[PDB]
Tab-separated table of C-alpha atoms and ligand atoms in Angstrom:
chain	number	residue	atom	x	y	z
A	6	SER	CA	-8.312	9.645	27.402
A	7	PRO	CA	-6.747	9.262	31.011
A	8	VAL	CA	-3.412	10.632	29.954
A	9	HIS	CA	-3.895	13.398	27.050
A	10	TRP	CA	-2.871	16.785	28.214
A	11	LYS	CA	-1.796	15.336	31.745
A	12	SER	CA	1.336	17.027	33.158
A	13	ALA	CA	4.422	14.801	34.165
A	14	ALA	CA	3.775	15.779	37.531
A	15	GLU	CA	0.185	14.731	37.355
A	16	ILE	CA	1.004	11.374	35.835
A	17	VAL	CA	3.832	10.829	38.544
A	18	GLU	CA	1.094	11.180	41.212
A	19	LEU	CA	-1.629	9.183	39.312
A	20	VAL	CA	1.053	6.277	39.106
A	21	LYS	CA	2.651	6.490	42.779
A	22	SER	CA	-0.957	6.767	44.054
A	23	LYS	CA	-1.900	3.702	42.153
A	24	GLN	CA	-4.895	5.264	40.518
A	25	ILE	CA	-3.494	4.219	37.138
A	26	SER	CA	-1.028	1.436	36.307
A	27	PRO	CA	2.040	2.072	34.109
A	28	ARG	CA	0.601	-0.360	31.663
A	29	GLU	CA	-2.478	1.688	31.098
A	30	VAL	CA	-0.335	4.724	30.788
A	31	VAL	CA	1.536	3.042	28.118
A	32	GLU	CA	-1.451	1.689	26.099
A	33	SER	CA	-3.379	5.029	26.327
A	34	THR	CA	-0.230	6.914	25.116
A	35	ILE	CA	0.090	4.267	22.236
A	36	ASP	CA	-3.629	5.043	21.454
A	37	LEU	CA	-2.994	8.866	21.271
A	38	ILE	CA	0.064	8.185	18.933
A	39	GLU	CA	-1.783	6.138	16.622
A	40	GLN	CA	-4.833	8.485	16.614
A	41	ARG	CA	-3.000	11.821	16.394
A	42	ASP	CA	0.487	11.325	14.782
A	43	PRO	CA	-0.609	10.383	11.456
A	44	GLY	CA	-0.984	14.125	10.702
A	45	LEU	CA	1.935	15.360	12.664
A	46	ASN	CA	4.741	12.813	11.408
A	47	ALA	CA	6.487	13.445	14.531
A	48	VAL	CA	7.263	9.684	15.338
A	49	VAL	CA	9.945	7.771	13.376
A	50	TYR	CA	10.441	4.731	15.665
A	51	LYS	CA	7.906	2.981	17.903
A	52	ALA	CA	9.370	1.042	20.865
A	53	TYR	CA	5.869	-0.129	21.940
A	54	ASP	CA	6.909	-3.508	23.151
A	55	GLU	CA	9.739	-2.357	24.932
A	56	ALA	CA	7.732	0.138	26.955
A	57	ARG	CA	4.932	-2.644	27.485
A	58	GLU	CA	7.914	-4.682	29.295
A	59	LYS	CA	9.124	-1.881	31.246
A	60	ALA	CA	5.579	-1.040	32.380
A	61	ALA	CA	4.863	-4.769	33.643
A	62	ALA	CA	8.136	-4.425	35.550
A	63	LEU	CA	7.508	-1.139	37.021
A	64	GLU	CA	3.794	-1.972	37.776
A	65	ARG	CA	5.192	-5.096	39.835
A	66	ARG	CA	7.484	-2.899	41.901
A	67	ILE	CA	4.855	-0.159	42.683
A	68	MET	CA	2.481	-3.227	43.899
A	69	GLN	CA	5.378	-4.773	45.859
A	70	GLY	CA	6.360	-1.513	47.568
A	71	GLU	CA	9.922	-1.723	45.916
A	72	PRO	CA	11.708	1.401	45.011
A	73	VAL	CA	10.648	3.550	42.107
A	74	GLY	CA	11.783	6.462	40.304
A	75	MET	CA	11.201	10.306	40.441
A	76	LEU	CA	9.503	10.157	37.056
A	77	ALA	CA	7.775	6.797	37.530
A	78	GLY	CA	5.330	6.159	34.769
A	79	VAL	CA	6.045	9.422	32.758
A	80	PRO	CA	5.932	8.451	28.845
A	81	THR	CA	8.526	10.171	26.715
A	82	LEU	CA	10.201	9.789	23.698
A	83	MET	CA	13.925	10.604	22.422
A	84	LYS	CA	15.357	12.386	19.228
A	85	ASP	CA	16.570	10.503	16.248
A	86	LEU	CA	19.779	12.337	15.974
A	87	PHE	CA	23.055	10.752	17.067
A	88	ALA	CA	20.615	8.727	19.019
A	89	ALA	CA	22.120	5.864	20.992
A	90	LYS	CA	20.064	3.245	22.842
A	91	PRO	CA	21.228	-0.504	22.587
A	92	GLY	CA	19.014	-2.061	19.962
A	93	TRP	CA	17.493	1.116	18.607
A	94	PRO	CA	17.733	2.725	15.391
A	95	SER	CA	19.870	5.648	14.769
A	96	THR	CA	19.422	7.441	11.408
A	97	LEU	CA	20.947	10.891	11.851
A	98	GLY	CA	17.953	12.633	11.208
A	99	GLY	CA	16.489	10.560	8.391
A	100	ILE	CA	19.433	9.308	6.194
A	101	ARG	CA	17.878	6.348	4.198
A	102	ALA	CA	21.177	4.649	3.988
A	103	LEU	CA	21.208	4.025	7.883
A	104	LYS	CA	17.789	2.719	8.287
A	105	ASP	CA	19.126	-0.838	9.189
A	106	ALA	CA	21.525	0.481	11.789
A	107	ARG	CA	21.043	-0.639	15.516
A	108	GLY	CA	22.672	0.692	18.568
A	109	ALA	CA	25.379	-1.580	20.016
A	110	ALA	CA	25.271	-2.770	23.634
A	111	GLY	CA	26.194	-0.433	26.394
A	112	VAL	CA	26.186	2.777	24.456
A	113	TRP	CA	23.802	5.300	25.755
A	114	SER	CA	22.706	8.843	24.895
A	115	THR	CA	21.998	10.990	28.089
A	116	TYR	CA	18.181	11.475	27.709
A	117	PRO	CA	17.344	7.850	27.350
A	118	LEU	CA	19.668	6.693	29.875
A	119	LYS	CA	18.724	9.198	32.779
A	120	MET	CA	15.102	9.404	32.189
A	121	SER	CA	14.513	5.579	32.083
A	122	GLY	CA	17.011	5.471	35.185
A	123	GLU	CA	14.275	7.387	36.948
A	124	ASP	CA	11.555	5.151	35.513
A	125	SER	CA	10.314	7.361	33.069
A	126	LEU	CA	8.833	5.123	29.864
A	127	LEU	CA	10.423	5.510	26.442
A	128	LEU	CA	8.131	4.826	23.654
A	129	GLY	CA	10.045	5.685	20.751
A	130	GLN	CA	12.036	8.107	18.703
A	131	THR	CA	11.154	11.485	17.040
A	132	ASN	CA	11.899	13.195	13.817
A	133	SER	CA	14.945	15.548	13.065
A	134	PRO	CA	16.261	16.872	9.842
A	135	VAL	CA	19.490	15.215	8.445
A	136	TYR	CA	22.518	15.778	10.781
A	137	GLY	CA	20.464	18.324	12.583
A	138	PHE	CA	21.637	20.886	9.885
A	139	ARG	CA	18.564	23.161	9.805
A	140	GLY	CA	15.780	24.872	12.045
A	141	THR	CA	13.296	23.017	10.367
A	142	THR	CA	12.286	19.404	10.384
A	143	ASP	CA	12.127	17.692	7.143
A	144	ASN	CA	14.159	14.964	5.147
A	145	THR	CA	13.709	12.758	2.278
A	146	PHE	CA	13.217	9.579	4.321
A	147	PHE	CA	10.378	10.377	6.816
A	148	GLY	CA	9.248	13.647	5.594
A	149	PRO	CA	8.392	17.075	7.380
A	150	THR	CA	7.064	17.121	11.075
A	151	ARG	CA	3.969	19.368	10.965
A	152	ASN	CA	2.897	22.016	13.452
A	153	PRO	CA	-0.060	21.170	15.685
A	154	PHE	CA	-1.209	24.758	15.434
A	155	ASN	CA	-1.396	24.606	11.727
A	156	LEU	CA	-0.609	21.651	9.854
A	157	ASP	CA	0.362	23.512	6.617
A	158	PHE	CA	3.285	24.727	8.661
A	159	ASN	CA	6.362	23.280	10.047
A	160	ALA	CA	7.075	22.460	13.632
A	161	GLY	CA	10.494	23.754	13.581
A	162	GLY	CA	13.696	21.981	14.279
A	163	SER	CA	15.929	20.102	14.671
A	164	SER	CA	13.766	18.671	17.686
A	165	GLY	CA	10.649	19.213	15.650
A	166	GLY	CA	9.345	15.527	16.314
A	167	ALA	CA	9.627	16.298	20.029
A	168	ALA	CA	7.982	19.616	20.176
A	169	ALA	CA	5.011	18.650	18.035
A	170	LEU	CA	4.316	15.564	20.423
A	171	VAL	CA	4.262	17.773	23.472
A	172	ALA	CA	2.459	20.719	21.895
A	173	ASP	CA	-0.470	18.355	20.827
A	174	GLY	CA	-0.801	16.934	24.150
A	175	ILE	CA	0.337	13.533	23.495
A	176	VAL	CA	3.442	13.255	26.058
A	177	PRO	CA	4.080	15.772	28.768
A	178	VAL	CA	7.873	15.838	28.189
A	179	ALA	CA	10.329	14.911	25.341
A	180	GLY	CA	13.867	15.078	24.472
A	181	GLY	CA	15.730	17.609	22.379
A	182	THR	CA	19.415	18.020	21.419
A	183	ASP	CA	20.736	21.610	20.704
A	184	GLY	CA	23.665	22.659	18.769
A	185	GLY	CA	22.236	25.872	17.202
A	186	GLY	CA	19.086	26.174	18.922
A	187	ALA	CA	17.193	22.888	18.555
A	188	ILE	CA	15.575	22.515	21.957
A	189	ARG	CA	14.338	26.173	21.809
A	190	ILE	CA	13.411	26.749	17.906
A	191	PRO	CA	10.751	24.240	17.690
A	192	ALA	CA	9.529	25.175	21.165
A	193	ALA	CA	8.983	28.625	20.012
A	194	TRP	CA	7.053	27.774	16.955
A	195	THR	CA	4.697	25.173	18.906
A	196	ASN	CA	3.880	27.133	22.215
A	197	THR	CA	5.957	24.813	24.281
A	198	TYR	CA	8.856	25.575	26.677
A	199	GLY	CA	12.233	24.469	25.605
A	200	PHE	CA	14.949	24.413	28.384
A	201	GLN	CA	18.635	24.769	27.323
A	202	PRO	CA	21.068	24.110	30.301
A	203	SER	CA	24.349	25.477	31.009
A	204	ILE	CA	27.267	23.747	29.293
A	205	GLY	CA	28.287	21.047	31.619
A	206	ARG	CA	25.078	20.924	33.427
A	207	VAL	CA	23.649	17.834	31.602
A	208	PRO	CA	26.491	15.189	30.526
A	209	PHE	CA	26.969	14.999	26.782
A	210	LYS	CA	28.842	12.139	25.102
A	211	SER	CA	30.809	13.082	22.143
A	212	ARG	CA	32.900	10.100	20.881
A	213	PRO	CA	35.302	9.266	19.213
A	214	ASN	CA	36.236	13.059	19.612
A	215	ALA	CA	35.248	15.051	22.902
A	216	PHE	CA	37.630	17.969	22.221
A	217	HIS	CA	36.025	18.803	18.763
A	218	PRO	CA	35.827	22.288	17.429
A	219	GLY	CA	31.951	22.478	17.198
A	220	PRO	CA	29.878	24.663	19.087
A	221	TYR	CA	28.612	23.789	22.786
A	222	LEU	CA	25.953	20.790	22.351
A	223	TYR	CA	23.196	20.330	24.933
A	224	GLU	CA	20.498	17.803	25.797
A	225	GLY	CA	17.432	19.048	27.563
A	226	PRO	CA	13.564	18.733	27.933
A	227	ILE	CA	10.743	20.294	25.732
A	228	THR	CA	7.449	20.489	28.060
A	229	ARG	CA	4.281	22.446	28.405
A	230	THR	CA	4.850	23.401	31.995
A	231	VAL	CA	8.073	25.028	33.655
A	232	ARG	CA	7.481	22.617	36.673
A	233	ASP	CA	7.702	19.824	34.230
A	234	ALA	CA	10.928	21.078	32.895
A	235	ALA	CA	12.313	21.441	36.468
A	236	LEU	CA	11.463	17.930	37.221
A	237	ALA	CA	13.193	16.560	34.086
A	238	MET	CA	16.102	18.651	34.858
A	239	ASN	CA	16.286	17.487	38.267
A	240	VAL	CA	16.819	13.810	36.671
A	241	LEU	CA	19.028	14.944	33.796
A	242	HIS	CA	21.570	17.330	35.297
A	243	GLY	CA	24.534	15.898	37.188
A	244	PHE	CA	28.343	14.988	37.199
A	245	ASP	CA	29.803	12.613	34.690
A	246	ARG	CA	33.690	12.679	34.734
A	247	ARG	CA	33.346	11.236	30.744
A	248	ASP	CA	32.002	14.932	29.695
A	249	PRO	CA	35.246	17.260	29.754
A	250	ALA	CA	32.987	20.227	30.684
A	251	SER	CA	30.826	18.441	33.349
A	252	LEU	CA	30.053	20.404	36.399
A	253	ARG	CA	30.368	18.515	39.744
A	254	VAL	CA	27.278	20.304	41.197
A	255	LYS	CA	24.073	19.082	42.615
A	256	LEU	CA	20.940	21.525	42.227
A	257	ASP	CA	17.188	21.380	42.949
A	258	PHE	CA	15.409	22.874	39.911
A	259	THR	CA	12.031	22.973	41.471
A	260	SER	CA	13.473	25.152	44.308
A	261	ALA	CA	13.458	28.050	41.987
A	262	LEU	CA	9.684	27.997	40.728
A	263	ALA	CA	8.379	30.109	43.417
A	264	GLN	CA	11.272	32.406	43.893
A	265	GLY	CA	9.868	35.284	41.402
A	266	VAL	CA	11.909	38.097	39.812
A	267	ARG	CA	11.355	40.951	42.310
A	268	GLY	CA	14.317	43.386	42.278
A	269	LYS	CA	16.073	41.681	39.263
A	270	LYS	CA	17.712	43.696	36.845
A	271	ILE	CA	16.825	42.590	33.169
A	272	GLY	CA	18.136	43.694	29.860
A	273	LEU	CA	16.028	43.420	26.598
A	274	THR	CA	17.116	43.203	22.867
A	275	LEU	CA	14.827	42.801	19.991
A	276	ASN	CA	17.568	41.602	17.560
A	277	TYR	CA	20.889	41.389	19.608
A	278	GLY	CA	21.606	44.410	17.296
A	279	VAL	CA	22.571	42.376	14.357
A	280	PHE	CA	19.603	40.311	13.178
A	281	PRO	CA	16.593	41.244	10.899
A	282	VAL	CA	13.589	40.506	12.809
A	283	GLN	CA	9.800	40.478	11.613
A	284	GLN	CA	8.193	43.454	13.109
A	285	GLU	CA	5.341	41.695	14.606
A	286	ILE	CA	7.611	39.591	16.699
A	287	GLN	CA	9.483	42.656	17.891
A	288	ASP	CA	6.211	44.110	19.152
A	289	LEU	CA	5.007	41.016	20.796
A	290	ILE	CA	8.541	40.484	22.790
A	291	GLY	CA	8.225	44.246	23.711
A	292	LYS	CA	4.783	43.615	25.370
A	293	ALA	CA	6.175	40.419	26.878
A	294	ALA	CA	9.024	42.258	28.576
A	295	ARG	CA	6.679	44.586	30.275
A	296	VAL	CA	5.110	41.355	32.310
A	297	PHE	CA	8.433	41.378	34.153
A	298	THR	CA	7.964	45.228	35.070
A	299	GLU	CA	4.574	44.552	36.766
A	300	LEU	CA	6.481	41.677	38.668
A	301	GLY	CA	8.855	44.013	40.314
A	302	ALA	CA	11.818	43.585	38.047
A	303	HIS	CA	13.599	46.392	36.437
A	304	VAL	CA	13.654	46.092	32.591
A	305	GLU	CA	15.710	48.226	30.103
A	306	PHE	CA	17.043	48.051	26.480
A	307	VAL	CA	20.659	46.894	26.058
A	308	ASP	CA	23.257	47.041	23.194
A	309	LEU	CA	25.580	43.817	23.037
A	310	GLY	CA	27.813	45.594	20.681
A	311	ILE	CA	28.579	42.506	18.484
A	312	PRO	CA	30.929	43.741	15.796
A	313	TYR	CA	30.241	40.969	13.293
A	314	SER	CA	27.279	40.806	10.742
A	315	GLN	CA	24.647	38.050	11.051
A	316	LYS	CA	25.994	36.343	7.991
A	317	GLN	CA	29.713	36.405	9.553
A	318	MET	CA	28.184	34.739	12.591
A	319	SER	CA	25.892	31.953	10.905
A	320	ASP	CA	28.848	31.170	8.464
A	321	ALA	CA	30.995	30.618	11.491
A	322	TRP	CA	28.494	28.260	13.039
A	323	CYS	CA	28.019	26.232	9.866
A	324	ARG	CA	31.572	25.582	9.503
A	325	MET	CA	31.959	24.622	13.271
A	326	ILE	CA	29.280	22.094	12.959
A	327	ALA	CA	30.229	20.849	9.572
A	328	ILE	CA	33.598	19.676	10.966
A	329	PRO	CA	32.364	17.046	13.264
A	330	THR	CA	29.743	16.298	10.338
A	331	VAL	CA	32.534	15.704	8.095
A	332	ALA	CA	34.230	13.350	10.644
A	333	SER	CA	31.010	11.354	10.920
A	334	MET	CA	30.637	10.981	7.039
A	335	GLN	CA	34.310	9.792	6.885
A	336	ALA	CA	33.656	7.278	9.584
A	337	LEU	CA	30.567	5.843	7.922
A	338	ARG	CA	32.196	5.652	4.556
A	339	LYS	CA	35.106	3.649	6.244
A	340	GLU	CA	32.385	1.379	7.661
A	341	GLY	CA	30.667	0.812	4.204
A	342	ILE	CA	28.054	3.470	4.182
A	343	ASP	CA	29.395	5.983	1.561
A	344	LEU	CA	27.319	9.571	1.779
A	345	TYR	CA	29.814	11.003	-0.391
A	346	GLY	CA	29.366	8.533	-3.484
A	347	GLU	CA	26.647	5.742	-3.728
A	348	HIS	CA	24.205	7.398	-1.312
A	349	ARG	CA	24.945	11.000	-1.918
A	350	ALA	CA	21.118	11.649	-2.630
A	351	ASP	CA	20.581	10.962	1.106
A	352	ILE	CA	22.235	14.480	1.920
A	353	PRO	CA	20.795	17.730	0.997
A	354	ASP	CA	22.542	19.967	-1.169
A	355	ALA	CA	22.513	22.910	1.253
A	356	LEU	CA	24.657	20.640	3.620
A	357	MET	CA	27.040	19.250	1.247
A	358	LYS	CA	27.902	22.703	0.498
A	359	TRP	CA	29.263	23.128	4.030
A	360	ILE	CA	30.778	19.492	3.843
A	361	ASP	CA	32.809	20.417	0.790
A	362	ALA	CA	33.655	23.740	2.210
A	363	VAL	CA	35.476	22.507	5.367
A	364	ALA	CA	36.960	19.400	3.926
A	365	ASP	CA	40.519	21.000	3.834
A	366	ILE	CA	39.488	23.985	5.907
A	367	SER	CA	42.672	25.850	6.706
A	368	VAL	CA	43.844	26.397	10.470
A	369	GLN	CA	43.507	30.258	9.658
A	370	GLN	CA	39.916	29.817	9.019
A	371	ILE	CA	39.276	27.580	12.180
A	372	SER	CA	41.273	30.356	14.081
A	373	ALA	CA	38.939	33.191	12.735
A	374	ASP	CA	35.937	31.275	13.743
A	375	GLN	CA	37.158	30.832	17.256
A	376	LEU	CA	38.005	34.588	17.441
A	377	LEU	CA	34.541	35.187	16.394
A	378	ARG	CA	33.042	32.864	19.074
A	379	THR	CA	35.105	34.470	21.761
A	380	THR	CA	33.942	37.934	20.770
A	381	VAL	CA	30.430	36.889	20.818
A	382	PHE	CA	31.053	35.090	24.347
A	383	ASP	CA	32.535	38.303	25.621
A	384	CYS	CA	29.572	40.474	24.331
A	385	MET	CA	27.345	38.165	26.387
A	386	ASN	CA	29.322	38.215	29.554
A	387	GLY	CA	29.381	42.119	29.231
A	388	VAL	CA	25.698	42.150	29.790
A	389	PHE	CA	26.023	39.731	32.708
A	390	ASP	CA	28.461	42.028	34.292
A	391	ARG	CA	25.442	44.363	34.910
A	392	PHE	CA	22.204	42.578	34.394
A	393	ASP	CA	20.751	39.359	36.060
A	394	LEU	CA	18.861	38.206	33.001
A	395	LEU	CA	18.611	38.900	28.932
A	396	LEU	CA	15.354	38.792	27.133
A	397	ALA	CA	15.247	38.253	23.283
A	398	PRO	CA	12.822	36.941	20.756
A	399	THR	CA	13.668	33.304	20.461
A	400	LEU	CA	13.521	33.489	16.654
A	401	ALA	CA	13.596	36.083	13.727
A	402	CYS	CA	10.520	34.838	11.879
A	403	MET	CA	7.169	32.845	12.132
A	404	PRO	CA	6.809	29.227	11.055
A	405	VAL	CA	7.275	28.390	7.537
A	406	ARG	CA	5.016	26.344	5.138
A	407	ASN	CA	6.317	22.626	4.713
A	408	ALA	CA	7.686	21.983	1.287
A	409	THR	CA	7.093	18.798	-0.687
A	410	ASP	CA	10.509	17.964	-1.632
A	411	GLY	CA	11.870	16.710	1.745
A	412	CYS	CA	13.689	19.876	2.173
A	413	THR	CA	11.858	22.601	4.152
A	414	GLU	CA	13.856	25.487	5.110
A	415	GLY	CA	13.550	28.903	6.777
A	416	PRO	CA	13.351	32.161	4.708
A	417	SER	CA	16.095	33.388	2.712
A	418	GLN	CA	15.326	37.009	3.444
A	419	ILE	CA	13.648	38.773	6.342
A	420	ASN	CA	12.622	42.580	6.009
A	421	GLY	CA	14.632	42.547	2.791
A	422	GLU	CA	17.886	41.427	4.286
A	423	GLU	CA	19.457	38.125	2.993
A	424	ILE	CA	19.813	35.501	5.786
A	425	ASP	CA	20.820	31.846	5.663
A	426	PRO	CA	17.657	29.852	5.371
A	427	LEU	CA	19.164	26.839	7.400
A	428	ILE	CA	20.074	28.823	10.710
A	429	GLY	CA	20.525	32.461	10.021
A	430	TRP	CA	16.959	33.500	11.747
A	431	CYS	CA	17.620	31.243	14.743
A	432	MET	CA	19.066	33.745	17.066
A	433	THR	CA	19.418	31.054	19.686
A	434	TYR	CA	22.759	29.827	18.206
A	435	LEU	CA	24.476	32.703	20.210
A	436	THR	CA	24.352	30.492	23.511
A	437	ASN	CA	25.840	27.546	21.617
A	438	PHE	CA	28.670	29.961	21.031
A	439	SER	CA	28.653	31.239	24.708
A	440	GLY	CA	27.626	28.521	26.946
A	441	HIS	CA	24.787	30.232	28.822
A	442	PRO	CA	21.645	28.688	29.881
A	443	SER	CA	18.559	29.761	28.154
A	444	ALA	CA	14.816	28.843	27.927
A	445	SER	CA	12.296	29.587	25.010
A	446	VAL	CA	9.071	30.673	26.937
A	447	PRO	CA	5.654	31.017	24.957
A	448	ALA	CA	4.951	34.662	24.394
A	449	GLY	CA	1.562	34.491	22.337
A	450	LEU	CA	0.187	34.013	18.896
A	451	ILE	CA	0.759	36.016	15.931
A	452	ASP	CA	-2.063	35.121	13.058
A	453	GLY	CA	-2.974	32.239	15.113
A	454	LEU	CA	0.789	30.776	15.117
A	455	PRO	CA	3.182	30.677	18.366
A	456	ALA	CA	6.075	33.043	18.877
A	457	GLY	CA	8.692	32.400	21.627
A	458	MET	CA	10.653	34.659	23.970
A	459	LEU	CA	14.187	33.662	24.994
A	460	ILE	CA	15.225	34.121	28.482
A	461	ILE	CA	19.137	33.969	29.087
A	462	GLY	CA	20.893	33.670	32.356
A	463	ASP	CA	24.517	34.107	33.477
A	464	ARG	CA	26.876	31.081	33.105
A	465	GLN	CA	25.586	28.447	35.432
A	466	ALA	CA	22.505	30.379	36.428
A	467	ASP	CA	19.931	27.856	35.166
A	468	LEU	CA	17.869	28.332	38.374
A	469	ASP	CA	17.538	32.013	37.553
A	470	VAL	CA	16.104	31.110	34.057
A	471	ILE	CA	13.797	28.724	35.642
A	472	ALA	CA	12.813	31.438	38.301
A	473	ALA	CA	11.858	33.924	35.565
A	474	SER	CA	10.276	31.361	33.335
A	475	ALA	CA	7.872	30.336	36.020
A	476	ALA	CA	7.116	33.923	37.090
A	477	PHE	CA	6.123	34.757	33.435
A	478	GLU	CA	4.219	31.595	33.321
A	479	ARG	CA	2.028	32.599	36.280
A	480	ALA	CA	1.491	36.294	34.784
A	481	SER	CA	1.323	35.424	31.223
A	482	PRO	CA	-0.015	32.050	30.785
A	483	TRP	CA	0.071	30.152	27.351
A	484	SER	CA	-1.809	27.094	28.181
A	485	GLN	CA	-5.049	28.390	26.859
A	486	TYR	CA	-3.619	28.372	23.466
A	487	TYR	CA	-3.418	24.450	23.567
A	488	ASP	CA	-7.074	24.808	22.790
A	489	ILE	CA	-6.007	25.289	19.089
A	490	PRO	CA	-4.359	21.884	18.822
A	491	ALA	CA	-6.837	20.258	21.353
A	492	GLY	CA	-9.706	20.843	18.625
A	493	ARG	CA	-7.861	20.236	15.489
A	494	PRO	CA	-9.560	17.791	13.136
A	495	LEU	CA	-7.897	14.101	13.008
B	1	LIG	C1	19.591	23.471	15.031
B	1	LIG	C2	20.394	22.424	15.813
B	1	LIG	O1	20.432	22.889	17.057
B	1	LIG	N1	20.865	21.306	15.249
B	1	LIG	C3	21.824	20.589	15.762
B	1	LIG	C4	21.397	19.696	16.794
B	1	LIG	C5	22.335	18.915	17.443
B	1	LIG	C6	23.408	18.557	16.762
B	1	LIG	O2	24.209	17.691	17.385
B	1	LIG	C7	23.787	19.435	15.647
B	1	LIG	C8	23.007	20.328	15.224
């Protein structure tokens, strides 16, 4: 294959130097998807002819010396969760009742708009759980997205299809969305790099309600290299007056790749003082943290002092996400797609529990959750009063086995403590409360399966996160572990 395992940086140079046509990039990527995706079950929509059309036009511009974009010829896919691209489907993570829906003219999600704007080629959409409402990827319409490191296990979620394609070498970058960790969760379970930007760094369009009570929502890349993530972030970030959090700031993310971390003060936590975390993960992260000490950074353990239990916090997150989920379900029912009645089977019971719970949620309850959120925000800020960076495990547990009922979920206990199987073990959701940028960096393998370390920066310190990530990547590479999916039976 001319493109299998090639980086985005490599493909851009192959295309711009005219070593390979955009046409061949598309046909070769299609070959890989048809050959390798049957096992992964990561792709839920194929836009092959559209990509072929775009490649023909890109090829003409290249041969004629007309202007081309920063990501010219890079193949990618977007996530099927609140997906908006004209003419494309949007099933909200495998809701069968929505299978015939198609995007209206002029309405775009950020990832497909901006990536295609710089001449990346969109080949289709990737699998997500229903309404993104769990840290695994499975649903009863498309099924589970499986882990390239072991297909008996789940890829993670909700951006599981995105991470699976990237970890299997099929595309160098894929788009994720993140409301409780969905860029970072599947990255951790698949040995890939998931970058969740500062709130307001990448435009997020929430309509009809831009002022909803949900957590911070992000769009961001999943890649195999930090450089590819920096390139994608150069495209994705930027001012958009229609996002009420948007930052009117221009950055060069590639400028941070060679910065290093010498002299940086780094805080370390193994469980944020409140989560049950599998011991093997704690040990791996303790080792990973010491990589920064060899690089000239000063690392020490920190206590965030979070006064809430992890169950209180996951319950609050579920209610926060459920309110806009309910708004969507009510809107759909008004347009003739009734997920409460006729198509109730399309909604997982675990989700409907929260849908029912917030149907007439009181202002007192809304307020209590906002107070919790504020407390977590301030606990995070307390760290960045004194430290440059915070390190933690991305997740409290290793990948789970796929179920056969379309409802793969996480564990309901870790170390004998009860934990919410949908999101409780996804410690990532703290930054959806707080707004800080963070990235999941591959920390190694435990019994042949990947585990991630989360690097968190100060508010708007995206470049610090990139700098630390690239430094770690150099000193503690993870690319060798791709030998496992590269050699898997097809
Ligand atoms: C795990 C997670 O982030 N889920 C999720 C992602 C996007 C969204 O809009 C709602 C929920």
